Design a binder for these strands. Structure first.
Ligand code: ZN
Lengths: 103, 59, 49, 145, 114, 115, 100
RNA sequence: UGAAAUAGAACUGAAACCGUAGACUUACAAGCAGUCAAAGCCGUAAUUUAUUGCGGUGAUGGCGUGCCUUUUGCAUAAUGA
RNA sequence: ACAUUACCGAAGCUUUGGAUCUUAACGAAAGUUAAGAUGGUAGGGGAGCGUUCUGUAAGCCAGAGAAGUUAAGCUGGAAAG
């Protein structure tokens, strides 16, 4: 059993007991998350597809932590112009543990 | 008539390893002393060759 | 340790020039491309060419 | 802890098991036949298609000598080749090339339509063309198409 | 007031060499070649970070088109019906679905054809 | 790695490493008898230099391990590095001079009791 | 092949390779815009749909006077003679919808 | 002997350069040698254990005309190492 | 060529996460929000890293291991630490 769920406009494939890495969510909502926009549910054989959301179907999750990714570097330079620029970056991600898929 | 660009270490290594390669001489143990001598040459250690003395080996 | 605590703006740094591309005062060092002025000079005598 | 990877899935080529497909070329049009063959060979009919690796099936073409053309191509299509020696340009019309090598036109067309590089050459290795209506790969139980 | 201590250039070079480890030939040890190859590599890294989005979307589209080859729905029409029936599922999701669980994707297609 | 009890080292020998390495390749891993025969046979300066170093290494091993004879020994490893260089002048036409480098080599041989 | 001729030919082929479907879409948009402009004293929403790069200087000035700087720019304006004239100048780069 | 002799005519001993050993890859292929994807092999940590990561190698796919200076304009077969 | 419905397709547009600056509002202020605005050579303005010496420093940290290369790991938006 799994769910195809939209969080903040990004699809994910949620499975129970099992973490999701999503875009950083505000400190305000670091307590207990409920997501109401489920696109698809596959339960033990049979599948329900929402138009655009499957009604009466929730996903309940517990916020766990925030974690930074590996560092990336944006670099550019202009040939035979003696000019460049370098910028570092590290994106932040939030990890949520899916408890149950209200099906 | 002059190198246009410095060759890569791969090319230099390849050429050097192929060219600077010496081959082992064949051997055959002397019937007299048991030394390993060059095949078809007088033994340098005892002087015999096919059971015939030819040298008188000194110091 | 008593931290003299200089007033702000009391000493500009300098206009160190010709020390890299990132400083904005790089190879050409504020002089432009070529000509008389690129090489130390300008005809002084209130000159109008 | 375990993370649900919401990333594109890649299927290990050691768990994909290649079949053979028979395609008949009788009374078909050369380009259409070649296009079908390329689509099968490339792997573009499987959900896990990947241009990196070789995941498509193999193809046996039968009756390759009965491909039909339209227009005056039978008299006018030219197959060129160059010996790399000076002036050594040799042409060969469709008639003559077909008579000398019955499988050559279809092999040439499929080679042109396949991608280029090591994988393209491998894909062409994955193809068998027969002039007649019978093939020697009976041991593979090829699926007819 | 002589200000010579040259513990700077070796530092720059050590960082560069650390980042340029696996390169071919003399590009991994010489300072000049390593710096040239690294600098063009980082620019490639930026460009390619933006290109990876295009590449993966193209892959997903091709996979969807392959999974639909069976049925009679050209996937332009598939996207058509998808939007028209108001199913806002994603190209990545559909591509992965057609591999993990083919029958769900097939059911989606039956549902689109309406 | 080295059992430095069993090894010989010859520093600044009068030959170029580029010329001594092939002879080393021909005896690496061979038995002591075979290697000694090869070096005696082959009429190369590097061959004679290796012969001296190899014989010395075997002598050291025997001296420190009295129950090891000439026919349980095999040449385990052989390394040939480059040593000091000397520059001398070779004068050419039109007053042009060229510098004429003379190279030396270090030789390291370790023997070991055969399999 | 002579360079003068091949440049002419390449340019002519590029120009002639336009799609009638795209032309029909553009014609439909123009008709809609003219129909809207023909009205009088209504609030109209103006979207900018074509870029400012490469266009004429006068027309860039008109668009910046309407308030649109980028593609995707949204501005509501009250149709009087001034706005009608500006819209007529820049009709080919805008999309007009009506604010009920 | 000396605290040390990879302190023995020399302290700390890098880079360029020359090597040895082990692991991986390579002899049907047209690679500014890199980046983005990626099977297999090897090292390693977790999850009861062969599927996920830190790693090193990398078949194959996509993209990509070294750099500096000078010019209306250079991968340019303009200049310089 | 003429019609109908589409889709693909850029660093454009939209959305998500993060940073700086201008203006405006709120706030005692710090800052919090709203709006837009940030390709860029010549060239102008502004903000920092790092090296050596001097006062701080007859301070603090070192033979229980200073300085320096050297392997690995980590942080910072860049100089880097
Ligand atoms: Zn003898």
């Amino acid at each position: 059993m799994y769910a195809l769920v939209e969080i903040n406009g990004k699809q994910y494939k949620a499975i129970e007991g099992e973490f999701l890495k999503i875009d950083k969510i505000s400190p305000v909502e670091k307590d207990k998350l409920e997501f109401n926009s489920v696109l698809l549910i596959n339960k033990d054989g049979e599948v329900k597809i929402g138009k655009p959301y499957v009604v009466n179907s929730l996903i309940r999750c517990t916020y766990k932590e925030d974690k930074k990714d590996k560092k990336v570097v944006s670099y550019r330079y202009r040939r035979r112009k003696s000019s460049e620029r370098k910028v570092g970056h590290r994106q932040t991600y939030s990890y949520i543990l899916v408890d149950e898929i209200v099906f | 008539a002059v190198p246009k660009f410095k060759p890569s270490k791969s090319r230099s290594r390849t050429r050097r390893s192929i060219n600077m390669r010496k081959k082992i001489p064949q051997f055959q143990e002397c019937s007299n002393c048991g030394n390993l001598g060059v095949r078809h040459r007088i033994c340098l250690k005892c002087g015999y060759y096919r059971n015939n003395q030819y040298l008188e080996i000194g110091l | 340790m008593f931290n003299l605590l200089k007033p702000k703006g009391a000493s500009k740094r300098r206009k160190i020039v010709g020390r890299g591309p990132g400083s904005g005062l790089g190879k050409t060092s504020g002089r432009g491309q070529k000509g008389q002025k690129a090489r130390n000079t300008s005809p002084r005598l209130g000159f109008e060419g | 802890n375990k993370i649900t990877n919401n990333d594109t899935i890649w299927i290990k080529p050691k768990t994909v098991e290649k079949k053979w497909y028979v395609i008949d070329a009788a009374d078909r049009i050369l380009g259409k036949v070649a296009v079908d063959v390329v689509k099968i060979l490339r792997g573009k009919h499987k959900a896990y298609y990947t241009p990196h690796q070789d995941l498509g099936d193999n193809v046996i073409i039968i009756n390759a000598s009965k491909v039909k053309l339209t227009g005056k191509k039978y008299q006018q299509k030219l197959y060129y080749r160059h010996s790399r020696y000076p002036g050594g340009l040799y042409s060969d019309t469709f008639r003559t090339l077909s008579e000398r090598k019955p499988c050559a036109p279809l092999e040439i067309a499929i080679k042109g339509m396949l991608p280029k590089g090591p994988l393209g050459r491998n894909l062409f290795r994955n193809l068998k063309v027969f002039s007649g209506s019978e093939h020697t790969l009976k041991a593979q139980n090829p699926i007819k198409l | 007031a002589r200000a010579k201590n040259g513990t700077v250039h070796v530092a720059r070079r050590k960082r560069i060499l650390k980042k340029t480890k696996g390169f071919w030939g003399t590009k991994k040890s010489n300072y000049k070649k390593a710096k040239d190859t690294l600098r063009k590599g980082m620019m490639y890294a930026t460009r390619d970070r933006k290109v990876r989005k295009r590449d993966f979307r193209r892959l997903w589209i091709s996979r969807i088109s392959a999974a639909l080859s069976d049925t009679g729905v050209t996937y332009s029409r598939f996207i058509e019906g998808l939007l028209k029936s108001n199913i806002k599922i994603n190209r990545k999701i559909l591509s992965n679905l057609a591999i993990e669980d083919v029958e769900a994707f097939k059911k989606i297609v039956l549902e689109i054809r309406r | 790695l080295v059992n430095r009890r069993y090894t010989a080292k010859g520093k600044n020998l009068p030959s170029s490493p580029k010329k001594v390495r092939p002879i080393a390749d021909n005896i690496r891993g061979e038995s002591y008898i075979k290697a000694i025969a090869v070096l005696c046979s082959m009429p190369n300066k590097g061959a004679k230099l290796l012969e001296k170093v190899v014989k010395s290494a075997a002598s050291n091993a025997m001296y420190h391990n009295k129950n090891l004879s000439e026919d349980m020994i095999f040449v385990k490893t052989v390394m040939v590095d480059d040593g000091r260089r000397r520059k001398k002048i070779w004068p050419r036409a039109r007053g042009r001079a060229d510098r004429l480098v003379n190279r030396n080599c270090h030789i390291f041989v370790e023997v070991d009791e055969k399999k | 092949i002579k360079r003068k001729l091949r440049l002419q030919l390449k340019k002519a082929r590029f120009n002639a390779s336009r799609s009638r479907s795209k032309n029909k879409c553009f014609i439909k948009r123009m008709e809609n815009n003219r129909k809207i402009i023909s009205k009088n004293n209504i609030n109209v929403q103006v979207f900018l749909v074509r870029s400012l790069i490469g266009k004429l200087n006068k027309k860039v000035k008109v668009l910046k006077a309407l308030g649109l700087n980028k593609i995707g720019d949204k501005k509501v304006h009250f149709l009087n003679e001034s706005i009608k004239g500006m819209l007529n100048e820049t009709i080919n780069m805008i999309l007009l919808s009506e604010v009920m």
